[PDB]
Design a protein around this ligand. Structure first.
Ligand SMILES: NC1(C(=O)O)CCC1
Length: 282
């Protein structure tokens, strides 16, 4: 049985408590079909790991992959709650990956099934399937806020009058560490970065964070569901999400094959109509 690691990230992965009896609430999609739910163990003050209910775009994809490739699995949420960047550890010069990247490389996971950004930095250590989704980075702000994009002066010439940030240890860090100007901006963001996307988004709603830089697939969904939040500027650092596996895995070819077929037969498009574009904000 493959150990699949994922992370809370609506609409790709929803995480909810189980019912008192340990089962998952029966729900239905916008089409009337049952929502497929899997048990995913992970962190819920003292930290506790417990069985929870997971569902969403990536869970449906996982279920399809498992059926197509005939494998069984067990899902768990990344222990440190991060996507993954490489940093020095234990105050030494030894570098290790944190987040889902670290769990895959350590063997705690055999496959990463989540909205994981494909980039050169990560590709040096793991293998990615071809993209199952094409997207990029954008910016989330409160309705009414005026910003041109990543080149806006309030971003390029930072001030305590307009606070912007991202989520720590994600591909946004990787991307910004590739340009001097962006590097400076990231150092400034570092003082405000959040632990999770959900917390940063809530901060924008509460007017505690003026701009949140993150994945457009996630931000456009959030903005489409909350009439008080909007995305702004042109997308930058276009990239795709892919399934992550260790180098020389026996699953890479078949995973990419399944993803290709899903892009060909409408399966991926159907996931978008089920989980991304289906209702107005409320
Ligand atoms: N998809 C992300 C990643 O780190 O994989 C980029 C924002 C989270």
């Amino acid at each position: 049985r493959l150990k699949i690691v994922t992370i809370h990230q609506e609409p790709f992965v929803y995480v909810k408590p189980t019912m008192s009896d340990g089962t998952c609430k029966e729900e239905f999609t916008v089409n009337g079909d049952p929502v497929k739910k899997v048990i995913c163990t992970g962190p819920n003050s003292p930290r506790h790991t417990v069985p929870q209910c997971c569902y969403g775009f990536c869970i449906d994809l996982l279920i399809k992959l498992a059926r197509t490739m005939n494998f069984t699995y067990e899902v768990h949420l990344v222990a440190d709650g991060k996507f993954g960047t490489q940093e020095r550890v234990n105050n030494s010069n030894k570098k290790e990956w944190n987040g889902m990247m670290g769990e895959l490389l350590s063997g705690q996971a055999d496959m990463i099934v989540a909205p994981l950004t494909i980039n050169n930095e990560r590709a040096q250590y793991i293998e990615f399937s071809k993209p199952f989704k094409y997207q990029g980075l954008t910016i989330l702000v409160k309705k009414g806020t005026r910003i041109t994009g990543i080149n806006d002066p309030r971003l390029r010439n930072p001030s305590d009058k307009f606070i912007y940030a991202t989520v720590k240890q994600s591909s946004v860090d990787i991307y910004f560490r590739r340009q001097v100007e962006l590097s400076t901006m990231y150092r400034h963001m570092e003082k405000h970065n959040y632990e999770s996307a959900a917390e940063a988004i809530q901060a924008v709603r509460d007017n505690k964070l003026h701009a949140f830089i993150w994945d457009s697939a996630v931000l456009e969904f959030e903005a489409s569901q909350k009439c008080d939040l909007v995305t702004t500027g042109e997308l930058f650092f276009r990239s795709g999400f892919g399934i992550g596996m260790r180098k020389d895995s026996p699953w890479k070819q078949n995973v990419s094959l399944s993803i290709l077929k899903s892009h060909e037969n409408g399966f991926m498009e159907d996931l978008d109509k089920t989980w991304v574009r289906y209702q107005e904000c409320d």
